[PDB]
Amino acid sequence: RPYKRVLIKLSGGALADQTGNSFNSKRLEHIANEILSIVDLGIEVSIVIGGGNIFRGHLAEEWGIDRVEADNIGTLGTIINSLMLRGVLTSKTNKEVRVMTSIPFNAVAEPYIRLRAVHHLDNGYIVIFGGGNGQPFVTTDYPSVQRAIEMNSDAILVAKQGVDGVFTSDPKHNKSAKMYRKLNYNDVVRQNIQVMDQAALLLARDYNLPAHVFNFDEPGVMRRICLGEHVGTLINDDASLLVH
Amino acid sequence: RPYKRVLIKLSGGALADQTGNSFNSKRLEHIANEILSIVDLGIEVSIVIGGGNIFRGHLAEEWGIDRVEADNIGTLGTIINSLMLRGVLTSKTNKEVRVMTSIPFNAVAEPYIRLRAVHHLDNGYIVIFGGGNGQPFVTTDYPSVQRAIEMNSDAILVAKQGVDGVFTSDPKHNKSAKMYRKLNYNDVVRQNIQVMDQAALLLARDYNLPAHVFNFDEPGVMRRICLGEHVGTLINDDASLLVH
Amino acid sequence: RPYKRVLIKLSGGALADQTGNSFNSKRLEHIANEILSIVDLGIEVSIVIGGGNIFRGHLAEEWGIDRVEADNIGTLGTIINSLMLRGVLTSKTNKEVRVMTSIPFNAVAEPYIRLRAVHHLDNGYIVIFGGGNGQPFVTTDYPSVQRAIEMNSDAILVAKQGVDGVFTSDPKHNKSAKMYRKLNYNDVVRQNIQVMDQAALLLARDYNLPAHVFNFDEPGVMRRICLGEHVGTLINDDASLLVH
Amino acid sequence: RPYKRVLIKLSGGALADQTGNSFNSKRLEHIANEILSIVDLGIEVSIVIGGGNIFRGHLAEEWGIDRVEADNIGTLGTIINSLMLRGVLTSKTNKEVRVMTSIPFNAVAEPYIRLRAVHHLDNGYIVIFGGGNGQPFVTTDYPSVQRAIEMNSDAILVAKQGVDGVFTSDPKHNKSAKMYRKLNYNDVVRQNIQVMDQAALLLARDYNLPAHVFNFDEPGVMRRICLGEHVGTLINDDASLLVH
Amino acid sequence: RPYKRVLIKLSGGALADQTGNSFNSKRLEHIANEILSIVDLGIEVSIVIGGGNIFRGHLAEEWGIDRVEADNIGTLGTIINSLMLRGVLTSKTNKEVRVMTSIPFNAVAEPYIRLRAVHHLDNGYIVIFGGGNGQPFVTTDYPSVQRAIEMNSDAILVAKQGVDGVFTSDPKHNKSAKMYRKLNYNDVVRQNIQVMDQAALLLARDYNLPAHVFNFDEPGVMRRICLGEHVGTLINDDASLLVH
Amino acid sequence: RPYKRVLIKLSGGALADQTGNSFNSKRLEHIANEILSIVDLGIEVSIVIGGGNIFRGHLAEEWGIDRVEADNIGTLGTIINSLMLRGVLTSKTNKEVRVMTSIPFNAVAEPYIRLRAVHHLDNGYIVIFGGGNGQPFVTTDYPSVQRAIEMNSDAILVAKQGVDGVFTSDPKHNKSAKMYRKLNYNDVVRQNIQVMDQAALLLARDYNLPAHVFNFDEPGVMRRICLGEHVGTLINDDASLLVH
Ligand SMILES: Nc1ncnc2c1ncn2[C@H]1O[C@H](COP(=O)(O)OP(=O)(O)OP(=O)(O)O)[C@@H](O)[C@H]1O
Ligand SMILES: Nc1ncnc2c1ncn2[C@H]1O[C@H](COP(=O)(O)OP(=O)(O)OP(=O)(O)O)[C@@H](O)[C@H]1O
Ligand SMILES: Nc1ncnc2c1ncn2[C@H]1O[C@H](COP(=O)(O)OP(=O)(O)OP(=O)(O)O)[C@@H](O)[C@H]1O
Ligand SMILES: Nc1ncnc2c1ncn2[C@H]1O[C@H](COP(=O)(O)OP(=O)(O)OP(=O)(O)O)[C@@H](O)[C@H]1O
């Protein structure tokens, strides 16, 4: 469909090359351009970023840091990325971009407030959500679908980086994995498909939020999706299809 | 002297190798061991870490982010590093380690409260300060000297990497530069020596907080310092000396 | 198993008769006694209550109140019940009972803080959690399992009122519904069983939290469960069984 | 007089029938209509509701909860009622309706701020105050008169149920009790009349806030009052009169 | 009678001479000594100070500052005095003295929390309450009685300067005015006696708090009162007496 | 030169005569007029006041209050003065004047937020900063320069009372001391000139903020300075001059 309000979910990994780590101005420029391409059509955007380029559980395990404790750390990463992204975004747009946090940091970002968030979006601002949900045991996926629904979003675009959609089985291997053009919710859980949190998926299904999994790394594809093109995978309550 | 209370100032750069970036478990293990070695003498320790291994102004300039905005981003880094550090320290100690923030994040760290901080230290806890000062235009040095004094610290140990103390002119060229055994405040400013912030220097001087600049990368040296040994450089209101 | 730490989840409905509504001192006395029966064995308890006896979606629909808005209201109900329950509990015990909120109300209840919560429990206090998760789109079930895991609980006891366990199909009808002695996670989702949130169930499964669904209305049964007796249904990763 | 700004004080009991308890959509519809009827004249309205339809001291006594503790519980009720009310009002109006709390709950309601409250009212919003005063030992009356004055209100309309105004001696026996058309402050206290708190009364008197006690259950009467009509009782520093 | 717990109400004017203004260390020393005399008997003390030696409505009027605004300024005065007083008290006692505010300033004083205040008192600390009630339109009298009741105080000692009690009619004038040994509440309001806020009087009368009005400026007298002596005036529900 | 944006640093002592203490409405009127004279040219003004007319370390020492504690008291002084000043300013201007605190007091003043402050200033408001920096060990000078830079101020006007500028050596004594027309930063520190904090000086020197030291007590002079005139002393990175 032609969406008017959208929620883009970005992995923290997308902001960094893979090499050393952190940020990579070539990657931040790509991200910014892809984002501005949508807003330029007057679509209202909310962005939820992960903190993967800063902090990983790989280290929490190493020092046996309590899971709730490792999540708090990783959450701060998301706020660092949100703040960065805003810098990059402001440089290229003249639109207002607001960073809202689930852990009010104030004088760093605005404490997150729903109706305020809706308000901004309505006023045509770009809003960025940091610190996800504020809760533990959860991935970037869940909070992001939760905010999408809270913000009366039309769709959630879940940006991937090199994987062009959702496949039957991991193509990084199997001669023949096929990619879904369409994918049912219940069908994803049934065939235990491993694309996004189950909890996120369920919520999205419960509220009828559609999701698009696609290649963020490929220029233009997020615009084509918003423009109505069928690129990548669409997760719906429609009945499953499959590229040909 | 034999100190009873100390504030160690660690750069974020110390928590990472240089290569890629972030954290380096070999480095975090060294840091923990060096800190434990001091507490093991029942010396009360406070730690102030920088956020350099996460965020650098090298970027802010790239995207022209406001100096005050870059500082807030870099500040969250200090809190990420504080939370890590704590994790590592807990793994190896039985002592209580408390992270206090100047930007109360709560349910992530304790909001900083002076007399609570003092109190902990008095109860033999290891306390870590994140978010520095909360203020802008300032480096890690300044807040660290400010918290040192606030905590009735006996000295501030400013841990350096690779560099053994304070020289006449940086050994990074001046072949025959010499290292000070002792360094007067007023003299450091006079001969415009660039070791730590002028502002931090001034404060320490005004409140008579002594400073030790030494090689943290060298096992033992922080203990020898606390044990009364003369290694690295001592910044005092005594009168300048010089290794031989 | 003989649990040492437990999380009891109580529906707000349990505090009221059904008639008019609110509280019912006969019901609050029952609740208190059932709770004290467990702690009297030195088991450490956390309680999560629903706000059903105060607020229902039946009215939100009636006035088309936004779902996120109706949830906030219902959340305040949970804090009213937590505070009440504490009153009733204090009257009958000499143990310390703490109410902790996910929306720090202060000077009404203590802002919820994990390690503090763990601490209390360790010190043998009875802790009550109000305001659930602080998030929308969620039922009392989910936050309660989340806090159970956060609090390193051994099991979650999900108290029912007239339904003695989990059945094949609703017995309020079908001549032959059988009750499970044991119930697999995956098995509950597979056969789309409608006992507790899927999201709560998944989390519990992911973290290995066991759950017991039973008759709170029947005196003694929560003690028998903690004492190791097989009464009601046990939701495990064991393989499904069935009463005979 | 023809008022430009008013503060209506509603008991929680008005939001419920008496029967069971809670809310009664027929009652919430009446309340909304009566409030709209006044704003429809471009009079600026603030509302203070009680929490009686949720919590009563009848219980606190039963379980001997501290008076200060019972008051906090009852206070949360006022905020639940404020949130409901707002929902109902939004459904029927296009005007902006704001809920401000004396216990900043945020992302549930706006923390109360005086000049913001005034400002709203000035911008023609309908504002609702929940959590009364935040203080104990006090009834709904007092804070409502305090917020009335704080808001530069022209009058306070104290909506009663079933009772048409203030009588000589409650018509609940005294057959020939008579209703005051006008009632002096000092006289209400002198002849110890029990209509509203002495403290609220005193304050109103000190700041010259006029009060109207009337039958809210009677359609129209709140408008007739604002329109200058003499219905119900007017509490003034004029000199006492009496219906005929 | 002998009281175990007591609230001392001190006006800001007592901390200063009258001359210029602010603080007078001779006066501060008197205040400290009188306070310690009472605690030295292991009576538990709470203190409420006014902000009069710093700010008075005399200006507010001059520049027409909103009464609510003037009070907010006046309130900051009480906190300043609390903090001073604490300094003074600390210098002379070994006891712990805690300053608690009604406007949580944190890292300046502790946010006021009831059960914490009670606890402190129970642990033999000296507690000082600053920022009164947080509310406008009210004097020091009211909040101080409110805090007395909240703290389960046995009596409220209202220290006056110059006047040894409550007289029939002010004695500058009334050459044969007489001082009450005992004063009924209802009588004070009846004969409209202007000694302390009506609102504060009514509260104390409703909860049975006894009040003592006496000459703070006279060494010993506050101890005499606590020792059971009959000096100054005692406001009770007993029946009015009169010195002879 | 002509400045568009300016920070005025006022000592607390200027609001009072010297005699007794507190506020002097003749002095407050002078201050208001001098401030308005500048804004009347549509120059944007921020103001930083000291708390000296209320509290001084003269006591702190007397009763040995911890330096950090004394400062916290001193800081409450600045907020009181801010609030007063605002009252005064409001009475004479139609312009909006906002008080922002570094210790969010809310419903007393607005919590300080940078971009909000900048915005206000941009919208032509007058902004007052209270509670300085929030930090200890520092004077009014430092925070005021820090806020100047944060606010993108063009200059910092440091109003002095009695002394028309910066002299070679203090003129009570130095009968032939001379006043600088211009003063280099590095020179002020070199010749250890004691006019304003070194720390404040260094900051301003690092960010290029120009400072003006002049006689506030002399009508007109602050306008003359802003009008491009050369009155008082100008601290720059130009090269030192000297009146003739
Ligand atoms: N930490 C923060 N907490 C709260 N608000 C913040 C914070 N940081 C920035 N702000 C915001 O406060 C400012 C204005 O508040 P507000 O949203 O009411 O603006 P507005 O008047 O509605 O819109 P506009 O900017 O177009 O004038 C903006 O600069 C915005 O960035
Ligand atoms: N955000 C926070 N705010 C306040 N307290 C916190 C926060 N995070 C952790 N805490 C702390 O609260 C708890 C209790 O505080 P405190 O240090 O005074 O304990 P205690 O009762 O004196 O005894 P103990 O030394 O055994 O902890 C600690 O266990 C610690 O985790
Ligand atoms: N709103 C609140 N916010 C924070 N703490 C609160 C609040 N309400 C009550 N408290 C608590 O503060 C008090 C003591 O704090 P703390 O947990 O450090 O106690 P403790 O010294 O560790 O234990 P104990 O009560 O056994 O002496 C208790 O009365 C407890 O109820
Ligand atoms: N907890 C809260 N804290 C602060 N603001 C809140 C909170 N909840 C809601 N708000 C509000 O923040 C928003 C913006 O504030 P404000 O009323 O000043 O809007 P505005 O920019 O001046 O214009 P408008 O009248 O269109 O809303 C509102 O839409 C309102 O929902």
Ligand SMILES: Nc1ncnc2c1ncn2[C@H]1O[C@H](COP(=O)(O)OP(=O)(O)OP(=O)(O)O)[C@@H](O)[C@H]1O
């Ligand atoms: N703004 C604040 N918020 C919370 N607590 C505060 C604040 N300011 C001060 N405190 C307090 O926290 C500190 C520790 O609290 P607490 O009195 O419960 O300590 P304790 O470990 O139980 O033992 P004790 O105080 O007797 O030495 C106190 O010294 C006091 O300074």
Ligand SMILES: Nc1ncnc2c1ncn2[C@H]1O[C@H](COP(=O)(O)OP(=O)(O)OP(=O)(O)O)[C@@H](O)[C@H]1O
């Ligand atoms: N403690 C506080 N926290 C937040 N905002 C506050 C606080 N105290 C005061 N305010 C402010 O909130 C009010 C509304 O904010 P704002 O200035 O952005 O209004 P506005 O609707 O955009 O228009 P305008 O102020 O020009 O009339 C101000 O009048 C000011 O009083």
